[PDB]
Amino acid sequence: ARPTVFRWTGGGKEVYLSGSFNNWSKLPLTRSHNNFVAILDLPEGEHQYKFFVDGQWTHDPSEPIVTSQLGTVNNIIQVKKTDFEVFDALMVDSQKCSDVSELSPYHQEPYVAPPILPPHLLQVILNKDTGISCDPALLPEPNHVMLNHLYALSIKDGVMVLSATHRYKKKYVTTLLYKPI
Amino acid sequence: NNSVYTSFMKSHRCYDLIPTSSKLVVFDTSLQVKKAFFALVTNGVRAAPLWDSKKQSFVGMLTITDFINILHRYYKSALVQIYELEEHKIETWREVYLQDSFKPLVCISPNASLFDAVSSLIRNKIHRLPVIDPESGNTLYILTHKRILKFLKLFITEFPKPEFMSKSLEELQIGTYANIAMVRTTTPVYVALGIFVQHRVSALPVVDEKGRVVDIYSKFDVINLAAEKTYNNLDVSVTKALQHRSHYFEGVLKCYLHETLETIINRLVEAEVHRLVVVDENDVVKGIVSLSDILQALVL
Amino acid sequence: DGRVKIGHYVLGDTLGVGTFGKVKIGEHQLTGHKVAVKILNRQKIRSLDVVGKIKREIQNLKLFRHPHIIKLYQVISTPTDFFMVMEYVSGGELFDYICKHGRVEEMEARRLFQQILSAVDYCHRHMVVHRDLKPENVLLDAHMNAKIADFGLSNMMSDGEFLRTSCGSPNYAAPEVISGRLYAGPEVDIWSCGVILYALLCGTLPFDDEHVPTLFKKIRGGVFYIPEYLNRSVATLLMHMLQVDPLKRATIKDIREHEWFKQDLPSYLFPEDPSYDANVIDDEAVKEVCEKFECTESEVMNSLYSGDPQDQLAVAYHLIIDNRRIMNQASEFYLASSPLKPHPERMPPLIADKKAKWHLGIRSQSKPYDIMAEVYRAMKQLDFEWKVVNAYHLRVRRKNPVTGNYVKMSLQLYLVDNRSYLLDFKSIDPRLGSHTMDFFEMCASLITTLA
Numbered sequence: 001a002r003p004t005v006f007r008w009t010g011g012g013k014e015v016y017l018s019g020s021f022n023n024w025s026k027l028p029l030t031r032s033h034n035n036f037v038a039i040l041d042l043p044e045g046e047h048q049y050k051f052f053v054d055g056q057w058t059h060d061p062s063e064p065i066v067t068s069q070l071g072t073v074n075n076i077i078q079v080k081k082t083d084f085e086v087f088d089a090l091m092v093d094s095q096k097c098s099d100v101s102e103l104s105p106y107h108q109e110p111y112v113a114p115p116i117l118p119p120h121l122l123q124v125i126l127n128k129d130t131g132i133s134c135d136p137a138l139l140p141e142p143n144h145v146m147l148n149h150l151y152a153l154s155i156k157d158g159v160m161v162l163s164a165t166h167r168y169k170k171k172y173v174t175t176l177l178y179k180p181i
Numbered sequence: 182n183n184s185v186y187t188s189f190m191k192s193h194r195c196y197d198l199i200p201t202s203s204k205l206v207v208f209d210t211s212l213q214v215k216k217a218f219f220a221l222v223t224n225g226v227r228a229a230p231l232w233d234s235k236k237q238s239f240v241g242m243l244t245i246t247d248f249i250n251i252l253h254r255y256y257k258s259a260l261v262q263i264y265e266l267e268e269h270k271i272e273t274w275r276e277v278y279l280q281d282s283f284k285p286l287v288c289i290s291p292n293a294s295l296f297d298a299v300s301s302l303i304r305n306k307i308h309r310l311p312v313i314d315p316e317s318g319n320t321l322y323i324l325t326h327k328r329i330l331k332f333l334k335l336f337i338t339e340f341p342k343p344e345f346m347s348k349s350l351e352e353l354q355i356g357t358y359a360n361i362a363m364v365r366t367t368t369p370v371y372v373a374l375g376i377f378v379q380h381r382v383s384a385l386p387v388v389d390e391k392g393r394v395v396d397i398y399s400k401f402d403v404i405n406l407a408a409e410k411t412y413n414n415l416d417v418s419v420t421k422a423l424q425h426r427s428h429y430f431e432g433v434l435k436c437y438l439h440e441t442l443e444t445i446i447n448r449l450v451e452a453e454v455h456r457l458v459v460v461d462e463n464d465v466v467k468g469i470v471s472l473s474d475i476l477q478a479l480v481l
Numbered sequence: 482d483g484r485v486k487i488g489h490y491v492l493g494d495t496l497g498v499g500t501f502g503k504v505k506i507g508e509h510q511l512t513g514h515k516v517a518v519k520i521l522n523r524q525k526i527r528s529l530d531v532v533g534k535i536k537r538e539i540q541n542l543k544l545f546r547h548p549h550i551i552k553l554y555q556v557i558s559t560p561t562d563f564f565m566v567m568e569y570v571s572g573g574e575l576f577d578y579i580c581k582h583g584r585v586e587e588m589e590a591r592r593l594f595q596q597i598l599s600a601v602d603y604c605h606r607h608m609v610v611h612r613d614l615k616p617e618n619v620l621l622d623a624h625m626n627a628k629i630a631d632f633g634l635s636n637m638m639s640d641g642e643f644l645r646t647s648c649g650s651p652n653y654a655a656p657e658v659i660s661g662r663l664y665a666g667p668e669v670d671i672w673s674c675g676v677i678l679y680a681l682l683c684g685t686l687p688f689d690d691e692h693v694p695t696l697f698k699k700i701r702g703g704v705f706y707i708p709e710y711l712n713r714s715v716a717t718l719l720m721h722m723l724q725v726d727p728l729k730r731a732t733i734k735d736i737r738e739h740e741w742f743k744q745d746l747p748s749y750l751f752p753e754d755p756s757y758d759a760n761v762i763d764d765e766a767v768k769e770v771c772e773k774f775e776c777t778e779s780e781v782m783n784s785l786y787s788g789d790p791q792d793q794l795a796v797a798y799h800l801i802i803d804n805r806r807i808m809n810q811a812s813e814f815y816l817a818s819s820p821l822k823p824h825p826e827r828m829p830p831l832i833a834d835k836k837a838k839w840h841l842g843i844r845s846q847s848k849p850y851d852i853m854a855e856v857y858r859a860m861k862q863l864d865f866e867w868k869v870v871n872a873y874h875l876r877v878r879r880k881n882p883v884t885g886n887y888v889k890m891s892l893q894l895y896l897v898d899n900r901s902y903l904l905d906f907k908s909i910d911p912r913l914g915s916h917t918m919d920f921f922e923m924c925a926s927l928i929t930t931l932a
């Protein structure tokens with residue numbers, strides 16, 4: 001219902017898991033080639049745990065710790081509602097990255113070799129002929145990569161001519177603008 | 182099963198009719214109007230939405246009817262320049278044009294039904310309806326009767342065929358059979374333009390002395406005056422004005438009163454023309470059956 | 482208990498480690514049903530700052546339902562890790578199959594290639610590029626059917642955007658990928674498929690060298706050996722898929738039209754073939770049904786997969802597909818033909834008293850830093866605000882005084898030839914105005930004030 005992974009990567013011969021959830025009993029973990037793991041069903045909230053590796057209590061560095069009145073040091077886990085649905089978990093996770101982005105704005109200040117032009121941008125949709133039998137407003141299907149990009153005709157008379165191909169749902173419109181300058 | 186095409190029209194959005202990829206030419210209203218008509222020719226397009234930069238909105242359309250109106254109003258002689266065609270901006274021609282009456286932008290949303298599109302074309306007596314996205318404010322496409330009828334023909338197999346489809350033109354009475362605006366072989370271009378302006382028809386059958394169709398002068402053919410830059414001589418016969426297409430002209434597309442609605446629709450969709458000339462046994466004009474008459478009948 | 486369980490699945494041995502994540506076999510505790518479980522560490526995703534990349538990868542696999550792409554059944558979330566429960570295939574890598582056999586017999590090679598391409602086309606149509614296509618990433622089921630896997634290197638094809646990530650096996654990487662150049666995406670997957678086809682037929686790679694610089698040079702050169710046992714038909718296909726110039730390279734449309742590919746092609750593989758609509762789900766049509774009615778995607782799929790033929794949802798779904806077929810088969814009505822009786826509305830050319838050519842952005846022969854300093858002084862003069870992405874890439878903004886909305890565009894400086902440069906203008910994303918008009922007006926005012 002509520003799976004929680006307990007994984008030990010630190011190595012050893014035998015690893016046991018103890019915590020508030022099993023009354024500090026030794027739960028033997030199974031090994032893959034390196035990892036010792038256990039997947040338990042835990043309700044939401046705080047859960048205290050500790051690993052027992054080869055006769056010794058071992059601190060998990062990948063998690064926070066808590067210290068009791070009598071000096072017992074245990075690792076601590078938070079099981080949140082957001083942990084049990086991908087998109088909730090992913091939304092929480094991105095928020096932590098955005099929070100980190102803040103710790104590390106439109107303006108008018110200039111900056112303190114440029115990339116080679118993609119050949120695709122030189123396949124000009126308005127330069128290619130379409131064949132006399134079809135409706136003259138029709139065009140071939142555009143490559144997605146040339147959409148939103150600006151094409152122009154050299155200024156002739158006092159007129160600037162501009163065009164671009166834009167998407168509307170699954171259709172494409174190539175607009176031309178005749179603008180005096 | 183009569184409402185089958187009305188129900189079809191009501192179930193389909195304008196979006197369904199828009200090409201996967203198309204070209205749209207826009208003109209800023211401050212553009213010289215002669216430059217606008219040449220830009221229609223160069224881009225191979227008939228109509229262009231009008232963008233008013235100061236208002237930040239689409240205010241209308243520039244069509245071949247705008248060219249017909251400028252030529253007829255301002256042409257004086259082949260010996261004198263048409264100063265206003267050379268001088269006017271779209272902005273100033275429109276002030277002159279729409280001085281007497283009021284006419285705002287007629288447009289449709291890509292999410293509105295084809296029924297609404299047909300209703301707006303007829304109600305507003307137009308041929309070009311711009312599809313404008315309300316979300317982005319962008320004009321996406323210029324919708325026509327040709328486009329709508331061809332989309333309807335693709336789906337006629339998807340539904341039961343109403344009984345009127347197999348009924349003759351005479352029984353159904355679809356089209357105009359009285360006071361048909363026509364021109365003679367010798368009719369000057371200027372006179373023909375006057376007939377478009379007065380009668381607000383989209384094409385004139387060209388007839389011989391006996392009253393038989395020989396050619397057709399459509400509003401589309403007037404753009405050839407801009408293409409060939411022959412607009413300063415409107416004294417030239419309607420025949421001389423049509424000479425440019427004689428090497429690829431298959432003849433006048435016509436129909437008989439005894440022919441069925443389905444036959445006529447099929448003929449029009451295949452031909453990609455706006456109307457057929459209804460003739461008798463000996464090619465004498467008896468009437469007109471236009472896409473606007475057809476759509477009005479189908480979506481009524 | 483001893484065993485490691487996630488869901489009702491007991492985890493076994495590692496199948497392999499992919500580009501990102503560890504894959505273990507899982508066995509259903511009651512039925513013995515086998516799955517492949519991909520484990521993703523939450524902390525690793527955070528520290529590498531790839532949360533969005535993973536989110537999209539999961540969104541994409543949840544959406545994909547192709548017979549030749551490994552299916553995602555569920556994803557189990559926990560406080561530290563994500564478990565992606567996927568379809569298990571027992572045949573192993575296509576790689577090991579080509580090694581076991583010498584090379585693959587023409588008929589079976591053609592059939593496997595048709596299945597791989599079908600899966601790749603489906604990805605591209607959903608705006609995803611795999612980027613790590615190789616026989617090691619193509620898995621085989623018990624009936625020798627191909628299944629593409631590991632979307633760890635994949636990316637979204639975004640409008641007006643190019644990819645740079647130089648990623649994947651060098652032997653399978655396109656000349657533009659090994660060169661660190663900007664690419665579109667689909668052509669890069671096509672090159673890898675060309676390499677896989679050569680491997681199926683020959684049992685060897687077309688470009689191979691122990692010394693990596695020689696290999697890169699061999700790839701950039703595009704010279705490879707076509708053996709004599711390979712017919713002239715398949716050789717032309719190979720030559721077209723393995724074109725150095727991406728603009729001359731075969732597209733999926735080119736491949737589908739090829740005589741060698743068309744032979745014995747099953748009809749369920751591509752969208753315009755007879756059996757595709759009956760077998761492969763249309764995600765867009767499922768969404769239309771959810772909208773038109775008020776249901777879940779699963780409710781739509783259930784009426785299709787196990788419902789009655791007369792079902793309201795299935796009826797609605799098939800009507801969308803039937804209508805879509807009508808439209809798709811009137812191709813000349815929706816798209817322009819490549820260069821008969823001329824269209825009635827074909828305009829005569831404009832008489833002089835010359836065909837003008839369109840060009841991308843604006844070109845300059847000036848030094849890069851001198852071009853940028855000229856854009857900065859012209860932008861400030863126009864009261865435009867900006868954000869420096871890098872020295873040659875700016876995000877620029879201006880307020881429309883009539884509509885009140887902000888107008889955004891991206892400026893990219895590029896190298897064309899020896900001391901020839903190009904400044905690219907790209908729109909970003911008005912109700913009251915027009916988004917496209919705003920982009921052109923912002924462009925026109927910057928071009929005009931530029932020296």
Ligand SMILES: CS(C)(O)Nc1ccc(-c2ccc(-c3nc4[nH]c(O[C@@H]5CO[C@H]6[C@@H]5OC[C@H]6O)nc4cc3Cl)cc2)cc1
Nearest residue numbers: 030031032035037485492493494502503520521522525562
């Ligand atoms: C041999 S038998 C007899 O058949 N019994 C048997 C014994 C143990 C297991 C077993 C099951 C699950 C894990 C496990 N491993 C994880 N590794 C990780 O994170 C790492 C860091 O990032 C890396 C990497 O992973 C994702 C990458 O991105 N999270 C994890 C979670 C879990 Cl549950 C480990 C072992 C299975 C079967």
Ligand SMILES: Nc1ncnc2c1ncn2[C@@H]1O[C@H](COP(=O)(O)O)[C@@H](O)[C@H]1O
Nearest residue numbers: 356357361362382383384385469471473
């Ligand atoms: N040359 C014409 N003379 C008279 N009526 C016409 C002519 N051409 C079209 N009509 C009619 O005028 C209306 C508008 O047609 P249209 O301009 O062709 O869309 C329809 O009812 C047509 O039947």
Ligand SMILES: Nc1ncnc2c1ncn2[C@@H]1O[C@H](COP(=O)(O)O)[C@@H](O)[C@H]1O
Nearest residue numbers: 399401432433434454455456457458825
């Ligand atoms: N009934 C017809 N027969 C022959 N040509 C026609 C006919 N109707 C229109 N055309 C031509 O088709 C082109 C497009 O005209 P329209 O149908 O008015 O859009 C013009 O060049 C017309 O002269």
